[PDB]
Protein backbone atom coordinates (compact mmCIF):
# COMPACT_ATOMS: atom_id res chain seq x y z
CA UNK A 1 0.00 0.00 0.00
CA UNK A 2 1.07 3.64 -0.62
CA UNK A 3 -0.46 6.92 0.49
CA UNK A 4 1.94 9.71 -0.52
CA UNK A 5 2.24 12.77 1.69
CA UNK A 6 1.98 16.30 0.28
CA UNK A 7 5.39 16.95 1.77
CA UNK A 8 8.52 15.04 2.61
CA UNK A 9 9.32 15.36 6.36
CA UNK A 10 12.42 14.88 8.48
CA UNK A 11 12.26 13.68 12.07
CA UNK A 12 15.08 15.02 14.25
CA UNK A 13 16.10 13.85 17.70
CA UNK A 14 17.97 15.84 20.35
CA UNK A 15 19.67 13.43 22.72
CA UNK A 16 20.02 14.89 26.22
CA UNK A 17 23.73 15.00 27.04
CA UNK A 18 24.75 17.36 29.84
CA UNK A 19 28.33 17.53 28.49
CA UNK A 20 27.53 18.56 24.92
CA UNK A 21 26.25 21.59 23.05
CA UNK A 22 22.88 21.55 21.24
CA UNK A 23 24.36 21.17 17.77
CA UNK A 24 26.36 18.15 18.93
CA UNK A 25 23.31 16.33 20.35
CA UNK A 26 21.01 16.69 17.37
CA UNK A 27 20.50 13.98 14.78
CA UNK A 28 18.35 13.66 11.69
CA UNK A 29 16.73 10.26 12.35
CA UNK A 30 14.78 9.69 9.16
CA UNK A 31 12.96 11.25 6.25
CA UNK A 32 9.53 9.98 5.18
CA UNK A 33 6.95 10.87 2.53
CA UNK A 34 4.16 8.34 2.85
CA UNK A 35 1.56 7.53 5.49
CA UNK A 36 3.05 4.03 5.75
CA UNK A 37 6.57 5.28 6.45
CA UNK A 38 5.18 7.86 8.88
CA UNK A 39 3.59 5.14 10.97
CA UNK A 40 6.56 2.74 10.58
CA UNK A 41 8.77 5.43 12.02
CA UNK A 42 6.45 6.56 14.77
CA UNK A 43 5.75 2.92 15.70
CA UNK A 44 9.43 2.04 16.16
CA UNK A 45 10.67 5.01 18.21
CA UNK A 46 10.13 6.21 21.73
CA UNK A 47 7.04 8.36 22.15
CA UNK A 48 7.54 11.93 23.42
CA UNK A 49 6.37 10.62 26.78
CA UNK A 50 9.11 7.98 26.85
CA UNK A 51 12.07 10.31 26.29
CA UNK A 52 14.51 11.28 29.03
CA UNK A 53 14.16 14.74 30.49
CA UNK A 54 16.01 17.22 28.27
CA UNK A 55 15.32 15.45 24.99
CA UNK A 56 13.60 16.94 21.93
CA UNK A 57 11.88 15.70 18.80
CA UNK A 58 11.60 17.99 15.76
CA UNK A 59 9.55 17.34 12.64
CA UNK A 60 10.39 19.71 9.81
CA UNK A 61 9.85 19.78 6.07
CA UNK A 62 12.82 18.35 4.20
CA UNK A 63 15.41 21.08 3.68
CA UNK A 64 14.38 23.15 6.70
CA UNK A 65 16.91 22.98 9.50
CA UNK A 66 15.24 22.82 12.94
CA UNK A 67 16.60 26.16 14.08
CA UNK A 68 15.09 29.59 13.96
CA UNK A 69 18.10 30.99 12.06
CA UNK A 70 17.20 28.87 9.01
CA UNK A 71 16.02 31.06 6.10
CA UNK A 72 12.64 29.30 6.27
CA UNK A 73 12.22 30.09 9.99
CA UNK A 74 14.05 33.37 10.46
CA UNK A 75 11.10 35.65 9.57
CA UNK A 76 8.68 33.31 11.32
CA UNK A 77 7.55 32.24 14.77
CA UNK A 78 5.82 29.50 16.77
CA UNK A 79 2.57 28.71 18.49
CA UNK A 80 3.59 27.44 21.97
CA UNK A 81 1.69 24.95 24.16
CA UNK A 82 3.08 24.33 27.67
CA UNK A 83 2.21 21.09 29.42
CA UNK A 84 2.82 21.79 33.12
CA UNK A 85 -0.51 21.69 35.03
CA UNK A 86 -1.16 17.95 35.37
CA UNK A 87 1.11 15.39 37.09
CA UNK A 88 2.82 12.07 36.48
CA UNK A 89 0.95 9.80 34.08
CA UNK A 90 -1.80 12.30 33.29
CA UNK A 91 0.75 14.88 32.22
CA UNK A 92 2.61 12.25 30.19
CA UNK A 93 -0.62 11.16 28.50
CA UNK A 94 -1.54 14.72 27.57
CA UNK A 95 1.96 15.34 26.20
CA UNK A 96 1.70 12.30 23.93
CA UNK A 97 -1.80 13.30 22.86
CA UNK A 98 -0.64 16.78 21.85
CA UNK A 99 2.48 15.58 20.01
CA UNK A 100 0.80 12.84 17.97
CA UNK A 101 -2.31 14.89 17.19
CA UNK A 102 0.00 17.68 16.03
CA UNK A 103 2.06 15.33 13.88
CA UNK A 104 -1.09 13.89 12.28
CA UNK A 105 -2.49 17.35 11.58
CA UNK A 106 0.77 18.40 9.92
CA UNK A 107 1.58 15.40 7.71
CA UNK A 108 -2.10 15.11 6.81
CA UNK A 109 -2.07 18.78 5.74
CA UNK A 110 -5.00 19.76 7.95
CA UNK A 111 -4.22 23.45 8.32
CA UNK A 112 -6.77 24.55 5.76
CA UNK A 113 -5.14 26.36 2.84
CA UNK A 114 -2.03 27.42 4.79
CA UNK A 115 0.17 24.30 4.63
CA UNK A 116 2.84 26.21 2.70
CA UNK A 117 3.34 28.30 5.83
CA UNK A 118 3.98 25.32 8.15
CA UNK A 119 7.68 24.71 8.83
CA UNK A 120 7.63 22.06 11.50
CA UNK A 121 6.81 21.01 15.03
CA UNK A 122 8.97 20.80 18.15
CA UNK A 123 8.49 18.96 21.44
CA UNK A 124 10.81 19.75 24.32
CA UNK A 125 10.61 17.19 27.14
CA UNK A 126 11.50 19.07 30.35
CA UNK A 127 10.97 18.20 34.01
CA UNK A 128 9.55 21.68 34.70
CA UNK A 129 7.01 21.57 31.88
CA UNK A 130 7.01 20.06 28.42
CA UNK A 131 6.61 22.33 25.43
CA UNK A 132 4.91 21.52 22.14
CA UNK A 133 5.29 24.12 19.38
CA UNK A 134 4.13 24.61 15.80
CA UNK A 135 6.57 26.64 13.74
CA UNK A 136 5.42 28.90 10.88
CA UNK A 137 7.25 30.73 8.11
CA UNK A 138 6.04 34.31 8.26
CA UNK A 139 5.39 36.18 11.48
CA UNK A 140 3.88 39.16 9.58
CA UNK A 141 0.94 37.06 8.32
CA UNK A 142 -1.58 37.39 11.19
CA UNK A 143 -4.31 35.95 8.99
CA UNK A 144 -2.27 32.77 8.44
CA UNK A 145 -0.99 32.34 11.97
CA UNK A 146 -4.35 33.06 13.59
CA UNK A 147 -6.10 30.42 11.47
CA UNK A 148 -3.27 27.96 12.11
CA UNK A 149 -3.57 28.55 15.85
CA UNK A 150 -7.32 27.94 15.73
CA UNK A 151 -6.84 24.62 13.96
CA UNK A 152 -4.07 23.74 16.40
CA UNK A 153 -6.35 24.30 19.40
CA UNK A 154 -9.18 22.44 17.73
CA UNK A 155 -7.06 19.40 16.80
CA UNK A 156 -5.39 19.16 20.22
CA UNK A 157 -8.61 19.98 22.14
CA UNK A 158 -6.91 22.82 23.93
CA UNK A 159 -9.56 24.59 26.04
CA UNK A 160 -10.61 28.19 25.35
CA UNK A 161 -9.37 28.80 28.91
CA UNK A 162 -5.72 28.05 28.12
CA UNK A 163 -4.26 30.90 26.09
CA UNK A 164 -1.69 29.99 23.46
CA UNK A 165 1.12 32.35 22.61
CA UNK A 166 2.47 33.02 19.13
CA UNK A 167 6.05 34.15 19.57
CA UNK A 168 8.19 35.67 16.87
CA UNK A 169 11.58 33.92 16.66
CA UNK A 170 13.52 37.16 16.04
CA UNK A 171 12.21 38.77 19.23
CA UNK A 172 13.58 35.82 21.21
CA UNK A 173 17.17 36.87 20.43
CA UNK A 174 5.80 39.40 24.63
CA UNK A 175 3.53 37.38 22.29
CA UNK A 176 2.45 38.77 18.91
CA UNK A 177 -0.79 36.79 19.10
CA UNK A 178 -2.66 35.25 22.00
CA UNK A 179 -5.43 32.71 21.53
Amino acid sequence: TRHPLQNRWALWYLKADRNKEWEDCLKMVSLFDTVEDFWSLYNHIQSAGGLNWGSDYYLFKEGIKPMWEDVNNVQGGRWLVVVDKQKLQRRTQLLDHYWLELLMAIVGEQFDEYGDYICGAVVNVRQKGDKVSLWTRDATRDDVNLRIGQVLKQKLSIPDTEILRYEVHKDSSKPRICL
Binding site: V29, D37, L41, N43, Q110, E113
Partner: protein, 39 residues
Protein backbone atom coordinates in the same frame (compact mmCIF):
# COMPACT_ATOMS: atom_id res chain seq x y z
CA UNK B 1 -2.94 20.00 -5.96
CA UNK B 2 -3.46 19.33 -2.22
CA UNK B 3 -3.00 15.87 -0.70
CA UNK B 4 -4.71 15.61 2.68
CA UNK B 5 -5.41 12.84 5.16
CA UNK B 6 -7.75 13.46 8.03
CA UNK B 7 -7.37 11.97 11.50
CA UNK B 8 -9.66 8.96 10.99
CA UNK B 9 -7.90 8.03 7.74
CA UNK B 10 -4.44 8.17 9.32
CA UNK B 11 -5.49 6.27 12.43
CA UNK B 12 -7.27 3.61 10.39
CA UNK B 13 -4.07 3.19 8.35
CA UNK B 14 -2.13 2.66 11.57
CA UNK B 15 -4.65 0.24 13.05
CA UNK B 16 -4.76 -1.94 9.93
CA UNK B 17 -1.05 -1.74 9.09
CA UNK B 18 0.65 -5.12 8.69
CA UNK B 19 3.68 -4.30 6.52
CA UNK B 20 6.92 -4.13 8.51
CA UNK B 21 9.26 -1.15 8.85
CA UNK B 22 11.50 -0.83 5.77
CA UNK B 23 14.92 -2.23 6.59
CA UNK B 24 16.68 0.94 5.42
CA UNK B 25 14.71 2.98 7.95
CA UNK B 26 15.42 0.53 10.75
CA UNK B 27 19.14 0.54 9.99
CA UNK B 28 19.23 4.35 9.85
CA UNK B 29 17.50 4.60 13.26
CA UNK B 30 19.96 2.08 14.68
CA UNK B 31 22.88 3.99 13.17
CA UNK B 32 22.06 7.51 14.36
CA UNK B 33 19.65 6.99 17.29
CA UNK B 34 19.78 3.43 18.65
CA UNK B 35 18.63 4.61 22.08
CA UNK B 36 15.08 5.59 20.93
CA UNK B 37 14.52 2.43 18.90
CA UNK B 38 11.55 0.31 19.94
CA UNK B 39 10.94 -3.18 18.55
Amino acid sequence: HMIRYNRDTLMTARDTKRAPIPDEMLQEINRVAPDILIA
